Design a protein. Structure first.
Ligand SMILES: [Ca+2]
Ligand SMILES: [Ca+2]
Ligand SMILES: [Ca+2]
Ligand SMILES: [Ca+2]
Ligand SMILES: [K+]
Length: 299
């Protein structure tokens, strides 16, 4: 039954952010931020959205239906700052840190001067000291709790964390010692899940060894030669609008050497949608989905 005390000061990716009162008019950038506010029962605070990553989670459809901004995003990517400001926001809630730098909408200090708070999803901080190290489920719980505090939504945040933990509790790590390629896009040079993002978190959780684990980033290129030598037991396909799961199956099938891998010959594929690959509460839903598919797979 806690209610937030304002003014509230928080360190958010190394910027001091002070909230004089609960946010009322928020522009959310990326699906992660938009859906987190929907999930916390704060959809009515969303005055604009931009850079959405796909349809909302099915369980957020009824919240999204009450928020006109979800139906009319400002832009497919970053909107102009003028369009953002037209809605008289008190907060810009950015899924990626770059969006509130000079290379994005504007720097955070300049936005503060103009009367606009900024909040970067805590899971998305990129600098040393603030980047998850490593990303864990607790990183994501802490993000929910922090945003809940800012939005005076303490019970809602606790509920959301409890729901994520229940989903995770449904997963028993596979004990077969299997390895996996996490294949995002690319035919000439595959782009794969690296060792420091959601891909690694999810593979660790479901019990797959990531052949891309030595990549020190969320994603990286891996040559066909290196993939073939790694011999992944299972292949996770990210199903995105720009590279479908089927497209990647066809790439694998058509490759004159990778088509001879056991994983490819035996259709040992797991499929995850794009939005849960951005770290957030949906990532746990993605993990459940992959765990269920892996359970159904014989190898
Ligand atoms: Ca409103
Ligand atoms: Ca700055
Ligand atoms: Ca500055
Ligand atoms: Ca249970
Ligand atoms: K306010």
């Amino acid at each position: 039954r806690e209610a937030t005390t304002y003014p509230l000061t928080v360190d958010n990716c190394g910027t001091t952010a002070t909230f004089d009162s609960v946010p009322e008019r928020v522009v959310t950038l990326k699906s992660s931020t938009t859906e987190l506010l929907l999930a916390l029962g704060r959809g009515d605070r969303i005055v604009a959205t931009s850079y959405l990553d796909g349809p909302v989670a099915p369980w957020l459809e009824d919240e999204a239906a009450q928020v006109p901004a979800v139906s009319a995003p400002l832009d497919e990517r970053l909107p102009s700052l003028e369009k953002v400001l037209e809605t008289e926001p008190d907060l810009i809630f950015a899924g990626w840190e770059s969006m509130v730098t000079t290379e994005g909408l504007a720097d955070r200090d300049r936005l503060t001067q103009l009367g606009v708070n900024t909040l970067v999803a805590p899971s998305a901080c990129k600098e040393d000291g603030y980047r998850p190290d490593p990303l864990t489920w607790e990183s994501l719980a802490q993000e929910i709790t922090t945003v809940g505090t800012i939005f005076d939504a303490h019970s809602e945040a606790q509920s959301l964390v409890d729901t994520m933990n229940e989903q995770l509790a449904a997963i028993s790590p596979d004990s077969r010692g299997l390895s996996a390629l996490w294949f995002s896009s690319g035919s000439d040079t595959p782009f794969v899940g690296g060792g420091s993002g959601s891909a690694q978190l999810v593979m660790d959780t479901v019990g797959l060894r990531n052949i891309g684990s030595d990549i020190d980033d969320t994603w990286g290129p891996m040559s066909w030669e290196a993939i073939i030598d790694a011999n992944p037991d299972v292949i996770v396909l990210v199903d995105s609008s720009w590279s479908s799961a089927q497209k990647k199956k066809d790439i694998l099938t058509s490759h004159p050497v990778a088509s001879t891998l056991d994983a490819v010959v035996n259709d040992r594929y797991l499929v995850i949608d794009f939005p849960p690959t951005e770290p957030g509460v949906r990532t746990a839903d993605g993990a459940v989905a992959l765990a269920d598919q892996l359970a159904a797979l014989t190898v």
